Every structure is written in structure tokens, then in C-alpha cells.
Design a protein around this ligand. Structure first.
Ligand SMILES: CC(C)CCC[C@@H](C)[C@H]1CC[C@H]2[C@@H]3CC=C4C[C@@H](O)CC[C@]4(C)[C@H]3CC[C@]12C
Ligand SMILES: CN(C)CCC[C@@]1(c2ccc(F)cc2)OCc2cc(C#N)ccc21
Ligand SMILES: CN(C)CCC[C@@]1(c2ccc(F)cc2)OCc2cc(C#N)ccc21
Ligand SMILES: *[C@@H]1O[C@H](CO)[C@@H](O)[C@H](O)[C@H]1NC(C)=O
Ligand SMILES: *[C@@H]1O[C@H](CO)[C@@H](O)[C@H](O)[C@H]1NC(C)=O
Ligand SMILES: CCCCCCCCCCCCCC
Ligand SMILES: NCCCCCC(=O)O
Ligand code: NA
Ligand code: NA
Lengths: 214, 218, 540
């Protein structure tokens, strides 16, 4: 069989920068290599076929090159909506094999993480539970510390951090810190506080609220 | 208008079988090979095999020989793929893509099919609203959201006001724990639309077929 | 009193090579070699030759030069009951000549259509092409469709063969007159080569056996100069040793070498019949066989250089371009490859002419064996004139080929070639291999070789004649009978009853040997042991 090797699993670039992905094959392939684009949550989309040729309904900013084993997919003007995972696939010998996939992350300026803390609703209190939420929206990059505080004490148990994929409009990550607790323990504490440490500012963003009917 | 519509999500116990459909339109169905591609969570694409609609000329991969069975129907122009002896590895997203004879590229793909192979019970999602406090500072924009706790499998859809509007919303990936998934959603809307109009989050679960809608109240 | 001889050692010497080398050597060996281990296939191909092909070729070639009798009368001097063998072969020949010449008729129809400045299978603007037809020197970006076809494929499919006018074995009539005229010209060109006996068959051979090597040389240099031709050579020589673990490829190689040498038919017997008595047989058989194989080996390069160029011009994966395993590899793929080359008319003419000259000598010998036997069995009852009997055979073969000249003819070619003639020739060859070694005695055979060559044959050959060769044919016969291959040709699968038909044609060929054994056994008086004793002992 044939093994299509993609060395770079991840590549970083900025809006407007020239980016190129390499595709390594097992044996010689001559002309036949196709490049596919798969946006997060969508099906793969054909961009390039036969090394250089473009498929119908594809912008002029997508180009292809290479002849043999090493091939190159080139994007000149990276747009915000060009955020997707790119694959390369040979189409000469049976069976048809793909590559590892290169997740093209977009590099931009720093952004201040808007933090918003939310109290447990009455519908959740009816069932017998209480989860304090701490949302972190619009920031860059992905690396960011999240510290919880129930009543001045650093809470570490019952905390779940969830990082979303990069955005395709302004390229800003977003994460959610969840603190799931019981109702009995929730009715024994009043003011909750979640904070976040980022590289935009040295001072961690602090959010707090009171249980005493807001 | 070349469209390929597959079937919905499938939750099946290990050892059983599952069949996935593929309705084709917008082109001459008897002109192109029909293919199936398996994609695991976080992994790459994997060509299962193709089939010739004219006579059902099947061509499988050595890695999938005796694992998948491809069939076709010209009367309705629909392809089918059947999987037996299901394991946790088969829990993946499957596509059906059109392809010519030469050059062998995949021009049009289906939307995909989320397969989950597990003996875990189909658990209905717990929909708990997440409304901002009455002591917060209403600035130029307020952030809303809803919470989904405990469901199986990874088959849930949270919409906002029938998809209008959703310029500023953030959906957080499902986290699996104790056999049950848990996720959350948020939306950033200006202070000139809340709490004036009606903003209601919808949580649908196709596996359990349960649609619970909750309106946000300050 | 006596019979004739050879005009020169070479003519027969070539003549037998002209018999051995054919179309199968050109296209059949490269494919089966490429799909079964590649270059690795060279290992079991030789083992099945040395142990199985060569001893049968030499053992078959010795008896003919010793007894100097035909395929029929030689059994009267060995085992009269097996004399029916000599008849069976004859019947066999009648089937063989029914399709073997129609291929040359196709190549001839291609040759006469290759005198135009613009070759027919290059453009789609013809009276036989369809809307699917798509050629090159056309718009770029073209993408192949499931229903799309190539101008060469159309030319072979809808013009010369005209197979679209038949629904299969069921409805295949009518008959095409063009290929009838071609096969008539061929049945005429083989007439003037055999009618004068072994004098012309050793003189015409000079042209028919030497030309294919020149043509293969030209096509070899040409194919070697072609860009990306290393892909076909790579795929053609890429070692896949795992294939050797399969018990099938060995059987494939065995059948391949057996069919390529084509022993146990009486052709070698007849060619050996007209030769010196003190003449050597060892060196002859050895040299001839080594040529038949080497010729196949270089033919592999001749094919896969051009197919490598074809895969380069397309998109690699040579197997894809060489998916078809038949005449389509030459009449479509190779032809379409020729059309896209400079001086395409030249390389086409020498190619089709090469095919014709490749089949002609094999036909000469094929008929020559039967004619020789029949004349030797019915002497001077027969032999009053040779042109009369030869013509009488040729005409009968022509009327017997009318079934093949139909629109659905290639189907009958496959069916007869694979389900009928092949197990029957292997079978009768098995009866011969058993009859010579176990009835006449291998010791007396080695004594006869000791008489001719002056020295008894080695233990290596004796041990091959005793057990290796009969089991060699036995493996092939058993392998086929245990699992007959599913037939397929031009997107058309053969009916389930096809094997019933072929066998019916197969069994009806050797009906003469058991009924002839019963004839002698019912004719000779006395005890059955006495009749069988007179049926085992050579003629007083
Ligand atoms: C040469 C002679 C002795 C061979 C005759 C053997 C007979 C029994 C064989 C030979 C050809 C065969 C036939 C070939 C064609 C057809 C047409 C198909 O629609 C039904 C099967 C049928 C009818 C087959 C029946 C069996 C058959 C008639
Ligand atoms: C390619 N596929 C396997 C078809 C070939 C089958 C074959 C055949 C028929 C009966 C048997 F008992 C054994 C082999 O028919 C003709 C023939 C010629 C050669 C040569 N040179 C080799 C094999 C055969
Ligand atoms: C073997 N060498 C390569 C020549 C092949 C031509 C052939 C032959 C015999 C009678 C004819 F009238 C014309 C041609 O010679 C023997 C033979 C056996 C089978 C089988 N099964 C098929 C073809 C033939
Ligand atoms: C092409 O071939 C298919 C079947 O091989 C046939 O149905 C179709 O009609 C052909 N095209 C045209 C234009 O006739
Ligand atoms: C490329 O080939 C396809 C074949 O289906 C054709 O539909 C398309 O029009 C071609 N592209 C252009 C630009 O003509
Ligand atoms: C000597 C072995 C015979 C092999 C040739 C085919 C035998 C046929 C067996 C019976 C079926 C015949 C169909 C009528
Ligand atoms: N319908 C007949 C099929 C066989 C063709 C020979 C014939 O026309 O009699
Ligand atoms: Na041969
Ligand atoms: Na010949």
C-alpha cells in the first residue's frame, strides 16, 4: 500500500501571510495528489486535484505544486474563514490513502478574555444540584490559567475546563470553567469568585457574585 | 445542486450491526463511483471502499475486507453501507462521497454519520438555563447561555430562536464523564435586546429524540 | 519405401522454435509474471520448466526422431489401444484451429487498416464510435466516466470485433464477412507453406520466426526511449515473495510453461520425424526451450516499457492500465499507446505484422503434426497428393471457424480456449506421459536414447520421466478440475452453464480412446489378459 506522511501536524500563520503545507508519499506518485479542506464540524471539501489543478468553485488564493513524492499546497492570502484542517491524498494505486492532516491555526494579536460568572438556576435547584459557571470569551492564545475560589479558598475539585476550537471571524479562542456542586453545599456559601490569569495582563481577571438573590 | 444526504446518528450495542444510507441528487447517479470514508475522532480519513451503481461493482480495502458491506439502489439512487461485529473502534464518523473513474478524486461529500458503539443506555439531557444575575453591570452587551448535563451519546443540538440571530454565540465541546456527556452554550447579545424580546435556547437530543426548550429569565 | 527429411538442420530447428513462440509468449507471460510476485515469479517459472516442461519437451522430441511415425501410427508400435490418442489430438486440433486463426484475422484487419496516414483508433470521428468516445489532442481537464470509452476500445469493440451486435453466447449471429476474408487470406498463406510438405514449412519459417525478434527489438528500443517507462519495468520486476507462499502461483507457472512449450500434441513428434537418426535431441530441445522462455522474458520488457509509458501518461498504478488480461492488452492498450507516438503507422504495421508472423508458424506446425500423422496412419491410401489433404483440412478449419467469425466470437474464443481445449490437451498429454513411462517402459526408452545419442540419458531425466512429469501434469489437471476459473470478458460475465458446454466439447474430443480401447479389447480373441498383452506389447 501507500503511506502519505504529513510531518507537520500543526502550522501557525497570520492573516495575509503566505502559508504552505508539505505532503510526503511512500513511492513516486507523479501527478496524482489531491488536497482536501475540512472545516471543524463540516465534511471535507475538495480543493486541489492532480498536484496543481484546481476544482470548480474554488477561489484563486488556493494553489498546488509538486511532482514526485514531495508536494506543496500554497495559500497566499490567509482569510479568517480559511481556518480548517487540510488533508492530502494519493489517487493512483489501490487502495486510496490519506495523510495525517495539518490543522492550520491562525496567529493574531492578543485579546482580553471577557470573563462572566453565572449562578445555578432554580430549575437545577429543583432537581437537587448547583453548578457555578465561569465563561471566558474572546482571547488569544489558548494557553490561560483558571483559578476557582468558593469563599477565598482555592477550589480545585469539581472544576472542568473546556477549550473550543479557534474562531473563523476574528480568530479568538473561548473556554468554559465549570464548578459542579451539590445543593446542600451551595446553600452553605454565599459569594462565589472565579479568576483567570492570562498573558495580556499580569493581574488575573476576577469575577464574583452573591447567592443572596443576586 | 449536487447533494448527498446521509442518515442520522446511530447508537448501537457492541456485537450488533448498523446500516447507513446515502441519497444522491443533482447529477447522473449512474455516472460515478460511490465511496465510503471512515474518520475516527481526532484521526485522519480512511477509504473503506467504492461501488459501481451500474452493476454494484464493489471494491473494498484490505483493512475492511469482511468488515463493511456496500450495496446500491438505482430505483431511488441510494447507496448503503452495513457494519457487523461492532466495537469501540467503529465509533466514528462515516461519510459517503462521489468519485469519478479518473482522476480518482472526491468531489462531493455527505454531511456525515456519527456512529456510537456502546452498551450505555440512551440518557436524556438535563437542560438547565444560565441567566445573568440581577446585580451584574449591564454594559454595552450582555452574555447569556444554557447548560446541558448528562446525556448519551455525543448527539445534541442547541439552537437559539430558530437561528435568528446567532452572530455572537459560543458553543463549548461536550465533556464525557461517568458515561454521560456534559456541555454548555453562550451568546453575546447587546443590551438593547434583553430582556425585552424573547430569547429561548433549544436543546434537541436525536438519540433519545427529546427536544427541551428553555427561555432565559433574569 | 522411405519418407522425406529436413533440407537443413536449421529449418526444423527454427521451425520448432516457430512452433513454440507465439502470442502467449508476448502478452500472457508478462501479465501473469507481474501479478504473481513480479520478478520473483522467475523462480517457480524455471522450476516448473526444468522438472516439468523440459523433460516432456525432450521426451516428446525423442520418440518422434526415433520411431519416425505420426501421432497415430506411433502408438501402433507402442500401445495400440492408446492409438485413439492420435485421433483425439486430431479432433482437438479441429477445435484449436477454430479460434487460433481468428486472432490473426483481427491482427490482419488491423494491419490492412494501418496503411492510412491517420490511424482509425486515434480519432472519435468515425461511423462506429459513440457519444461516450473521448480521445486525446482534445480539450484538457477531461474526467473519465463509468460509461466513457476510448477510441481504441471503441475501434476494437464496435468495428473489427463488432461485439456490441451480440448479447452473448445466446445470440451471437450473424457472421462478419471482413474477418472471414481476412481468415481466408490467412488460410491461404498457411496453405502455400504446408502443401509442399516439410520443404516449404522449413523455408517459410525463415521469415515467420525471425521477424518477431526484430519487431520486438524495435519496439524495445522505442519503449525504452519512452518517458516514465521505468514504472512498468518496476511493477514488472518488483519482488513479492509472499506470493510464493500461495499454492496457486506454482500451478499458474506450471500451466504457463506447459502451454508455452506445447509438448504432448505430436507436433514435436512430426517435426522430429523428418530428421537424421544420429542427430542430437538434447542440445536441440534445450536451446529451443531456453529461447521460448528468454523470448518471453524480453517480451515482458517490450510490453511493460510501453505500458510504463502509458501509466506515466495517465496516472501510475500500472496494474490499472493492465487490468484487462487478454488481446485487449495488445489491440486496445498497446495500440492506443502506439497511436500517440511518432511514426505511429510504422510501429503499428510492424506490430500487427509481428502478431501475424507470430501466429503463422505455430499454425504451420499445429496443422503439420496432424497432417503428418494422418498421412502416416493411412499411407498411400493417402499421400497420393499432399495439397489435396492439406486443402481438405484448411477448408474444414475455415467452416469450423465460422462460429468464431460471428459478432459474439471472442466469447467463444475464451470459452473454447479455457473450458474446452486446455484440460483436454493436458489430459491427453497426461495419458501420453503415463503411457510412455509406465507401459512402454522408461528403461527401454533410455535404451533407445542410448541407441540414438550413443549414451543413456542421465538419472536426472529418468527420475523426471518416471514420476516428476506425470505428477506435474496431474497437479495442473487436478487443480483446474477442482476449481474451474470464473470467466469474464468485456464487462460480460459468463453464464453458469458455460462450464457445462466447454466440458461437453472437451469430453467429446477424447471419446475415441476409451471406445478404441474397447474396440481392440472387443476385437482381439482369446482371454482378456491375452488381448491386453497384445495391446501392451509392440508389434511383432
Ligand atoms: C456437443 C454436444 C454433445 C453438447 C451438448 C450438451 C448439452 C446438454 C449442453 C451443451 C450446451 C448447453 C446449453 C447451452 C445453452 C443454453 C441456453 C440457456 O438459456 C439454457 C441452458 C442451455 C439450454 C444449455 C443446456 C445444456 C446444453 C444443451
Ligand atoms: C489466465 N487464466 C488463468 C486463464 C488461463 C487458463 C488456461 C488453463 C486451462 C485448463 C488448465 F487445466 C490449466 C490452465 O487456459 C489456457 C491457458 C494458456 C497458458 C499459457 N501460456 C496458461 C494457462 C491457461
Ligand atoms: C503450443 N505452441 C505454443 C503452439 C500453440 C498452437 C497449438 C495449435 C494446435 C492445432 C492447430 F490447428 C493450431 C495451433 O499447438 C498445440 C496447442 C495446444 C492447445 C491447448 N490446450 C491450444 C493451441 C495449440
Ligand atoms: C455510453 O455507454 C452507456 C453504457 O455503456 C450507455 O448507456 C450510453 O447511452 C452511452 N452514451 C451515449 C451518448 O449513448
Ligand atoms: C472539467 O471537467 C469536467 C468534467 O465533468 C467538466 O464538467 C468541467 O466543465 C471542466 N472544467 C471546465 C473549466 O470546463
Ligand atoms: C479424463 C477426465 C475428463 C475431464 C474432461 C471433462 C470430464 C467431464 C465430466 C462429466 C461432465 C461432462 C459434461 C457432459
Ligand atoms: N436466435 C438464434 C441465436 C443463434 C444464432 C443462430 C441463428 O440465428 O439461428
Ligand atoms: Na510458447
Ligand atoms: Na509461431
Amino acid at each position: 500500500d501507500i503511506v502519505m506522511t504529513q510531518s507537520h501536524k500543526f502550522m501557525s500563520t497570520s492573516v495575509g501571510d503566505r502559508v504552505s503545507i508539505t505532503c510526503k508519499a511512500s513511492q513516486d506518485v507523479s501527478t496524482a495528489v489531491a488536497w482536501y479542506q475540512q472545516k471543524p464540524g463540516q465534511s471535507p471539501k475538495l480543493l486541489i486535484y492532480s498536484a496543481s489543478y484546481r476544482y470548480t468553485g474554488v477561489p484563486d488564493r488556493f494553489t498546488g505544486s509538486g511532482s514526485g513524492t514531495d508536494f506543496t499546497f500554497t495559500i497566499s492570502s490567509v482569510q479568517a474563514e480559511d481556518l480548517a484542517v487540510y488533508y492530502c491524498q494519493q489517487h493512483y494505486s489501490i487502495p486510496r490513502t490519506f495523510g495525517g492532516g495539518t490543522k492550520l491555526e491562525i496567529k493574531r494579536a492578543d485579546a482580553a478574555p471577557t470573563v462572566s460568572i453565572f449562578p445555578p438556576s432554580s430549575e437545577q435547584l429543583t432537581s437537587g444540584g448547583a453548578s457555578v459557571v465561569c465563561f471566558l470569551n474572546n482571547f488569544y492564545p489558548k494557553d490561560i490559567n483558571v483559578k476557582w475560589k468558593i469563599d477565598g479558598s482555592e477550589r480545585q475539585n469539581g472544576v472542568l475546563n473546556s477549550w473550543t476550537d479557534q474562531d473563523s471571524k476574528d480568530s479568538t479562542y473561548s473556554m468554559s470553567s465549570t464548578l459542579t456542586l451539590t445543593k446542600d453545599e451551595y446553600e452553605r456559601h454565599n459569594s462565589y469568585t472565579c479568576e483567570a490569569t492570562h498573558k495580556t495582563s499580569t493581574s488575573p481577571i476576577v469575577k464574583s457574585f452573591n447567592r443572596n438573590e443576586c | 445542486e449536487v447533494q448527498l444526504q446521509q442518515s442520522g446518528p446511530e447508537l448501537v450495542k457492541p456485537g450488533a450491526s448498523v446500516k447507513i444510507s446515502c441519497k444522491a441528487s443533482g447529477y447522473t447517479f449512474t455516472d460515478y463511483y460511490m465511496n465510503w470514508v471512515k474518520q475516527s475522532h481526532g484521526k485522519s480519513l480512511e477509504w473503506i471502499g467504492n461501488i459501481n451503481p451500474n452493476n454494484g461493482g464493489t471494491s473494498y480495502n484490505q483493512k475492511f475486507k469482511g468488515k463493511a458491506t456496500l450495496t446500491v439502489d438505482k430505483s431511488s439512487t441510494t447507496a448503503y453501507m452495513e457494519l457487523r461485529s461492532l466495537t469501540s473502534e467503529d465509533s466514528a464518523v462515516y461519510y459517503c462521497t462521489r468519485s469519478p473513474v479518473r482522476p480518482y478524486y472526491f468531489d462531493y461529500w455527505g454531511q456525515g454519520t456519527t456512529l456510537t458503539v456502546s452498551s450505555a443506555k440512551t440518557t436524556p439531557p438535563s437542560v438547565y438555563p444560565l441567566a445573568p444575575g440581577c446585580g451584574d453591570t449591564t454594559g454595552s452587551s450582555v452574555t447569556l447561555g444554557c447548560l446541558v448535563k448528562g446525556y448519551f451519546p455525543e448527539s445534541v443540538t442547541v439552537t437559539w430562536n430558530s437561528g435568528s440571530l446567532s452572530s455572537s454565540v459560543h458553543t463549548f465541546p461536550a465533556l464525557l464523564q461517568s458515561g454521560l456527556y456534559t456541555m454548555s452554550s453562550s451568546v453575546t447579545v447587546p443590551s438593547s435586546t434583553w430582556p425585552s424580546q424573547t430569547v429561548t435556547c433549544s436543546v434537541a437530543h436525536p438519540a433519545s429524540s427529546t427536544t427541551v426548550d428553555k427561555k432565559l429569565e433574569p | 519405401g522411405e519418407r522425406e527429411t529436413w533440407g537443413k538442420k536449421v529449418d526444423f530447428l527454427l521451425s520448432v522454435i516457430g512452433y513454440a513462440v507465439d502470442l502467449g509468449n508476448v502478452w500472457r507471460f508478462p501479465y501473469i509474471c507481474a501479478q504473481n510476485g513480479g520478478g520473483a515469479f522467475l523462480l517457480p517459472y524455471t522450476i516448473m520448466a526444468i522438472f516439468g516442461g523440459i523433460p516432456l519437451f525432450y521426451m516428446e522430441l525423442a520418440l518422434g526422431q526415433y520411431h519416425r511415425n505420426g501421432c497415430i501410427s506411433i502408438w501402433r508400435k507402442i500401445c495400440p489401444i492408446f492409438k485413439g490418442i492420435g485421433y483425439a489430438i486430431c479432433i482437438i486440433a479441429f477445435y484449436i484451429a477454430s479460434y487460433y486463426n481468428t486472432i490473426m484475422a483481427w491482427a490482419l484487419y488491423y494491419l490492412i487498416s494501418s496503411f492510412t496516414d491517420q490511424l482509425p483508433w486515434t480519432s472519435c470521428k468515425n461511423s462506429w464510435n459513440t457519444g461516450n468516445c473521448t480521445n486525446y489532442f482534445s480539450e484538457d481537464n477531461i474526467t473519465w466516466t463509468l460509461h466513457s470509452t476510448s477510441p481504441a476500445e471503441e475501434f476494437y469493440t464496435r468495428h473489427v470485433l463488432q461485439i456490441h451486435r451480440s448479447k452473448g453466447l445466446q445470440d451471437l449471429g450473424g457472421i462478419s464477412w471482413q474477418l472471414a476474408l481476412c481468415i481466408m487470406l490467412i488460410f491461404t498463406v498457411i496453405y502455400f507453406s504446408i502443401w509442399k510438405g516439410v520443404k516449404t514449412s522449413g523455408k517459410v519459417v525463415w521469415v515467420t520466426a525471425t521477424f518477431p525478434y526484430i519487431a520486438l527489438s524495435v519496439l524495445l528500443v522505442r519503449g525504452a526511449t519512452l518517458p516514465g517507462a521505468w514504472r512498468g519495468v518496476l511493477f514488472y520486476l518488483k519482488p513479492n515473495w509472499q506470493k510464493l507462499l500461495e499454492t496457486g502461483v506454482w500451478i499458474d507457472a506450471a500451466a504457463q510453461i506447459f502451454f508455452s512449450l506445447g509438448p504432448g500434441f505430436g507436433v514435436l513428434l512430426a517435426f522430429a520425424s523428418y530428421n537424421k537418426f544420429n542427430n542430437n535431441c538434447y542440445q536441440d530441445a534445450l536451446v529451443t526451450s531456453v529461447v521460448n522462455c528468454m523470448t518471453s522474458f524480453v517480451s515482458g520488457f517490450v510490453i511493460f516499457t510501453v505500458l510504463g509509458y502509458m501509466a506515466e501518461m495517465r496516472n501510475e498504478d500500472v496494474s490499472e492500465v493492465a487490468k484487462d488480461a487478454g488481446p485487449s492488452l495488445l489491440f486496445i492498450t498497446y495500440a492506443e499507446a502506439i497511436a500517440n507516438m511518432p511514426a505511429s503507422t510504422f510501429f503499428a504495421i510492424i506490430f500487427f505484422l509481428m502478431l501475424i508472423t507470430l501466429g503463422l508458424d505455430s499454425s504451420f506446425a499445429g496443422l503439420e503434426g496432424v497432417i503428418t500423422a494422418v498421412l502416416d496412419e493411412f499411407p498411400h491410401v493417402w499421400a497420393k497428393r499432399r495439397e489435396r489433404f492439406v486443402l481438405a483440412v484448411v477448408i474444414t478449419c475455415f467452416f469450423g471457424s465460422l462460429v468464431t467469425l460471428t459478432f459474439g466470437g471472442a466469447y467463444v474464443v475464451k470459452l473454447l480456449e479455457e473450458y474446452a481445449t486446455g484440460p483436454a490437451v493436458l489430459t491427453v498429454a497426461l495419458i501420453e506421459a503415463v503411457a510412455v513411462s509406465w507401459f512402454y517402459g522408461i528403461t527401454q526408452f533410455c535404451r533407445d536414447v542410448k541407441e540414438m545419442l550413443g549414451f543413456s540419458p542421465g538419472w536426472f531425466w529418468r527420475i523426471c520421466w518416471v514420476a516428476i512429469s506425470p505428477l506435474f501434469l496431474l497437479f495442473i489437471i487436478a487443480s483446474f478440475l477442482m476449481s474451474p476459473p470464473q470467466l469474464r470478458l468485456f464487462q460480460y460475465n459468463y453464464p453458469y452453464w458455460s462450464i457445462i458446454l466447454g466440458y461437453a466439447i472437451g469430453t467429446s474430443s477424447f471419446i475415441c480412446i476409451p471406445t478404441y480401447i474397447a474396440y481392440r479389447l472387443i476385437i482381439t480373441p482369446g482371454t482378456f489378459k491375452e488381448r491386453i498383452i497384445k495391446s501392451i506389447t509392440p508389434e511383432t
